Amino acid sequence: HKPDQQKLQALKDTANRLRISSIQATTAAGSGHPTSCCSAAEIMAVLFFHTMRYKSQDPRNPHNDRFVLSKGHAAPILYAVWAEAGFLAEAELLNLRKISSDLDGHPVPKQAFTDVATGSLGQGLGAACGMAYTGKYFDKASYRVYCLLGDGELSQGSVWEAMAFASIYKLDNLVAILDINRLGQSDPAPLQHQMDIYQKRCEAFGWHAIIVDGHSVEELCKAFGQAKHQPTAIIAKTFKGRGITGVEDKESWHGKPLPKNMAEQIIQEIYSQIQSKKKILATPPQEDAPSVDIANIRMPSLPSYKVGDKIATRKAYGQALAKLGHASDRIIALDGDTKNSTFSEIFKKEHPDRFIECYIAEQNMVSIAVGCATRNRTVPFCSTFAAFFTRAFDQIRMAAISESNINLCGSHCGVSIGEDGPSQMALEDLAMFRSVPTSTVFYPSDGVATEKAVELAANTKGICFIRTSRPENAIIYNNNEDFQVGQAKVVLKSKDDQVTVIGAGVTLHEALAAAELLKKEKINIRVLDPFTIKPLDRKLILDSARATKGRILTVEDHYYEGGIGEAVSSAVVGEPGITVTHLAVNRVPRSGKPAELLKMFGIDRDAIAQAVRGLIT
Amino acid sequence: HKPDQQKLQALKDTANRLRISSIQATTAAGSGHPTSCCSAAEIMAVLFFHTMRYKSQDPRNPHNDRFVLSKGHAAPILYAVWAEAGFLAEAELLNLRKISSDLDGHPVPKQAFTDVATGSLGQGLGAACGMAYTGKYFDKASYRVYCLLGDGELSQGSVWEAMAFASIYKLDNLVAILDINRLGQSDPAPLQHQMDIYQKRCEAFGWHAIIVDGHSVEELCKAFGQAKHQPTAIIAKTFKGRGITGVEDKESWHGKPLPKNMAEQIIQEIYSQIQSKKKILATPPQEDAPSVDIANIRMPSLPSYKVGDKIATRKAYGQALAKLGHASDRIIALDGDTKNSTFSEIFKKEHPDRFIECYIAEQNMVSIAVGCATRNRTVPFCSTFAAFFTRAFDQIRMAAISESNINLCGSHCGVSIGEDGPSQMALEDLAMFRSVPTSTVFYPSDGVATEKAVELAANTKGICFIRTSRPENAIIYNNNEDFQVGQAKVVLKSKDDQVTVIGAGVTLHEALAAAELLKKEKINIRVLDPFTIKPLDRKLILDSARATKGRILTVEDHYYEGGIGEAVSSAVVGEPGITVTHLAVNRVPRSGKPAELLKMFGIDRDAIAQAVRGLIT
Numbered sequence A, B: 001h002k003p004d005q006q007k008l009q010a011l012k013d014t015a016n017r018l019r020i021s022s023i024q025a026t027t028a029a030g031s032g033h034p035t036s037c038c039s040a041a042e043i044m045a046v047l048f049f050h051t052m053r054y055k056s057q058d059p060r061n062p063h064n065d066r067f068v069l070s071k072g073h074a075a076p077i078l079y080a081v082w083a084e085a086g087f088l089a090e091a092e093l094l095n096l097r098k099i100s101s102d103l104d105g106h107p108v109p110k111q112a113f114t115d116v117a118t119g120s121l122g123q124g125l126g127a128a129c130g131m132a133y134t135g136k137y138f139d140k141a142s143y144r145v146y147c148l149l150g151d152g153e154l155s156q157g158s159v160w161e162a163m164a165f166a167s168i169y170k171l172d173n174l175v176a177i178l179d180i181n182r183l184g185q186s187d188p189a190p191l192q193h194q195m196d197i198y199q200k201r202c203e204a205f206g207w208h209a210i211i212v213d214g215h216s217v218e219e220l221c222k223a224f225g226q227a228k229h230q231p232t233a234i235i236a237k238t239f240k241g242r243g244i245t246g247v248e249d250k251e252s253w254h255g256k257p258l259p260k261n262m263a264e265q266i267i268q269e270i271y272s273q274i275q276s277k278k279k280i281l282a283t284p285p286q287e288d289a290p291s292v293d294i295a296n297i298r299m300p301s302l303p304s305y306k307v308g309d310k311i312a313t314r315k316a317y318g319q320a321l322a323k324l325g326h327a328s329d330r331i332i333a334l335d336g337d338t339k340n341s342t343f344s345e346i347f348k349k350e351h352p353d354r355f356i357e358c359y360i361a362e363q364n365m366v367s368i369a370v371g372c373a374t375r376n377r378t379v380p381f382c383s384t385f386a387a388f389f390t391r392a393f394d395q396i397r398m399a400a401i402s403e404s405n406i407n408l409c410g411s412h413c414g415v416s417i418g419e420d421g422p423s424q425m426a427l428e429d430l431a432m433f434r435s436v437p438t439s440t441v442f443y444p445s446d447g448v449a450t451e452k453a454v455e456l457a458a459n460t461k462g463i464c465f466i467r468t469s470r471p472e473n474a475i476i477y478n479n480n481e482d483f484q485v486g487q488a489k490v491v492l493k494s495k496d497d498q499v500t501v502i503g504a505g506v507t508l509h510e511a512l513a514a515a516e517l518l519k520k521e522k523i524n525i526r527v528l529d530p531f532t533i534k535p536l537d538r539k540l541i542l543d544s545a546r547a548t549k550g551r552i553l554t555v556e557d558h559y560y561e562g563g564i565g566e567a568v569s570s571a572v573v574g575e576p577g578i579t580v581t582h583l584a585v586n587r588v589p590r591s592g593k594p595a596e597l598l599k600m601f602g603i604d605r606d607a608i609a610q611a612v613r614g615l616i617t
């Protein structure tokens, strides 16, 4: 698939038009990364005007090839290709980085041509893997996926997780293009132009690796055209600032715009090398992506638990997820070699074609989910121990910037796991997920609440987190109980309540046990289950407090900062007559039995009862 | 260095004693991972009783070889070697996982023989790299560093970052042993027993890679004895549950103890294979680690700023760090290809031998710092953009479980960076660091406070975080101002103050500007700079509020959850007459000029003034 002579020259001309646009935009803004754009200009021309198939007036079309700009600071050249393709007006490029424009400093999905935000390096290939996995195994469509990475970027371990994933899953519809321009931000990239080492690394991770001159349209086209039996890495030897005389291949230019006078001079030089004005039209795709049903997802039946039966919420999650897979053909499940502990294995057993084993690689797992959710093709649920979602916080952070709809279930929360000790204990997961701006944080306290959290999460936009627990605890809700995001439940009350005790998961059950102890001493307490920690039901909390002498006690299997107690305090601070006492975990824990650790860390029934007795007196 | 016939058999006997101890301990506990111990028994015997050099009665001795158990769930066999070596009493092994014991489910540094906690897979090799870098380049000592990893564990990208680091820095004093036992937790590891692929991956990342039969003491000893010119990977083909008949090489046994009856039978079988009772003594090390000065670290002079001069706190950090490097020969600086933006380049210029370029690999950077701080050999300061510390949250979490003394400086906080947009904006870093139990969170508002934060951090135990900013802001403190952890500063006050406004960094300066605006309308406000967000100066905040009609307004360049406003609210909730109003960033931002974004997100001078006017009225 070698371009003919006219097309070849038109591709070279296109590359130079892209350089000019990148320089013009960044000089107009007074910030940005023209030298990072210029190393990629021939790559971008060949991708957008020779290799890819897409609808230039409908960038989000489900039939289109996908492009992911992993080196997101080259955003101006992404904008430039979409102007060249006729989607964006050329004049709009000059509004790069303005508060009045959507051509922001790094790509974001408010742009029709951007599926995932990038800017935190090393994440784009994982998203691309999810898109390619979806294309091959779910859509079974003809679209291909292309991802452009920098060489400095290849220092990120997340890249190598994605490399390994793509070869395990035989993603022969995925191409990674590595812009080996020798330089990072503040020094040369470690391997510089040792092209052979990059080739060996890619081959060792199972990819077909082709070294090219990244400024040769000819060599680029030959590499893209080769038969593809594996994921393919095009390892492109380039120069940073290519085409900018005196800047090409030099340090001290990363993220530095050309000054006005210099841009004018350089642009005239580049423009003089352009042989024809006639632009290339993109070739349209084969329209073989299937229709996908986006109707509200409804469980096929009510929960079928029995009040008083004991089940851990981790197990209820797996049961509910498997049931959800009968509610929608769009549900997919991902897990990081923990399916026997999170109980996502139950979904795998019933719907194996929609389970993705991600292995021990949580960063990549989140990125796969993000990629699978793009263009609304699937509804992903990822699971591992909640503690290990800390390993993926930047991916989760970027998922919110990507306006992604993913669902994450983290098990084994808190000290109540017992003997494994703190390395496995999630004690900061509420803090982390609450800080994610698009998040909904579910903390189901029994199996019924867990099933309803799964159903609600499936239908809720944004980053949904479900915190599950290891201990078996009693079912306390009837199967017809109606749950909503942002609505708490009062699970014990009387006209004589002296404190409102807010607990969740294991501490809700400890609070109910404390209530039984206290009733023997003629002390009644109101017990409230938040259901969602974010958004928090401020109204029910305050109404409860006002019925209980203004007194609130929050008790949580989590550290003090960023959790339930701080959420509650922040919601009610300043309200007349309201007081809040907080019980949480004050330091790194240790191994012991679950009940022993709840006692040691001051969040068990006897600690709750003592706090209540002290409040009354 | 092949063991003679008696020693060879003694090593085999030792391996079998280690198997027995691992089974006994986990059966006694009723939990743990004997099959993960048993694959490693010959490796552990050869390391501890042939290859390593260490003082068996002084595991923390600075002259000793280091061992890192990256696959930390094999803790029972680590405990077993230290019993075999005579440091632990054999009987204590039976108290594994008890709340009354320190032999916890995964290793932790309350154990003399543990430097870094493990249990979150994929982190140990990075810590080992820091130990080896320290041994070679700082201590210039003869000790070597050994790290045992699982094969499932090799799916983590952090491992490959460490691999790449070790070859860049020529860590020929580092050995990684890969326990290729075919199986993970819930399925086979992806590559199973494809030993050649592991070899190719390690070689491609610059290591000398040797495939061995991991149950052959002979082959293990030959591999350890080979000349070392590069970091060395011993790629050991093993079987999970080796030596446990009917369990060896089987699925469904990860993290499952043998029941009592079965343990008795298996242990008798293993014991029958032991030919001699005579234990091997460990060989002691060459005592060539240098003395290190642990005196309090004092800057050689007061800060030398001038009130009213403009400097960004990011630049003040670099200046202060370089000065700190003249205060102590122990200070080291690490940075992830951002030294020209964080200004750690200033330290590199003055103290290049103590600067470690970590490249674009934040997870590994944190682990390197943790390893360098072990045994108090250095005082590390790591820097990058604060947003990118989210990429290393699990490493930071584990650092606190490791009781590590590291210092982290994250620049470019908040929307005030302007045009790069949200991918680069730290808006959740206060939430994240506040949740880390051993943390001190410094948020210096000018260059003087920044210099004093650096000095204090150097002398403070735990995870110290310093949040720096991009905008140039005025110096407001005199050079002799005395700063302490947990002590705030009132930077503007009058007898007629009507609100206490708490700001930090850019929002402190916006609050001072608001005060100047408001004074024109005869409205005075008290302005308070927290200095440390954790611990928070509750007393000064409350005393200030009580002088200002009980009214507090907090304003921060951070999301609402987990930041300054929630810290303050949580501290003062329920105090009679106190009210708290909060201004923060309510959603994912976008590109624009710094001042435009502060306005858009409601945290600039005019937003503060409007909030104040509303509180009074």
Ligand SMILES: Cc1ncc(C[n+]2csc(CCOP(=O)(O)OP(=O)(O)O)c2C)c(N)n1
Pocket (backbone or CB within 6 Å): A035, A036, A039, A071, A073, A119, A120, A121, A122, A149, A150, A151, A152, A153, A154, A179, A181, A183, A184, A185, A189, A240, B336, B337, B338, B360, B388, B391
């Ligand atoms: C996770 C992360 N860490 C650090 C940065 C800061 N950063 C932005 S661009 C860059 C250099 C990128 O170099 P490379 O990948 O070689 O791309 P090039 O611009 O040379 O094409 C750095 C370190 C980032 N954006 N993301």
Ligand SMILES: Cc1ncc(C[n+]2csc(CCOP(=O)(O)OP(=O)(O)O)c2C)c(N)n1
Pocket (backbone or CB within 6 Å): A336, A337, A338, A360, A388, A391, B035, B036, B039, B071, B073, B119, B120, B121, B122, B149, B150, B151, B152, B153, B154, B179, B181, B183, B184, B185, B189, B240
């Ligand atoms: C970051 C992280 N993710 C997931 C886990 C859960 N986990 C504990 S052990 C294990 C399997 C480890 O297998 P491998 O590395 O092959 O070690 P082996 O026990 O086979 O020697 C898993 C997935 C963990 N501890 N850490």
Ligand SMILES: [Ca+2]
Pocket (backbone or CB within 6 Å): A150, A151, A152, A179, A180, A181, A182, A183, A184, A189
């Ligand atoms: Ca580069």
Ligand SMILES: [Ca+2]
Pocket (backbone or CB within 6 Å): B150, B151, B152, B179, B180, B181, B182, B183, B184, B189
């Ligand atoms: Ca294994």
Ligand code: NA
Pocket (backbone or CB within 6 Å): A405, A406, A407, A456, A457, A458, A459, A460, A461, A462, A464
């Ligand atoms: Na959802």
Ligand code: NA
Pocket (backbone or CB within 6 Å): B405, B406, B407, B456, B457, B458, B459, B460, B461, B462, B464
């Ligand atoms: Na410190």
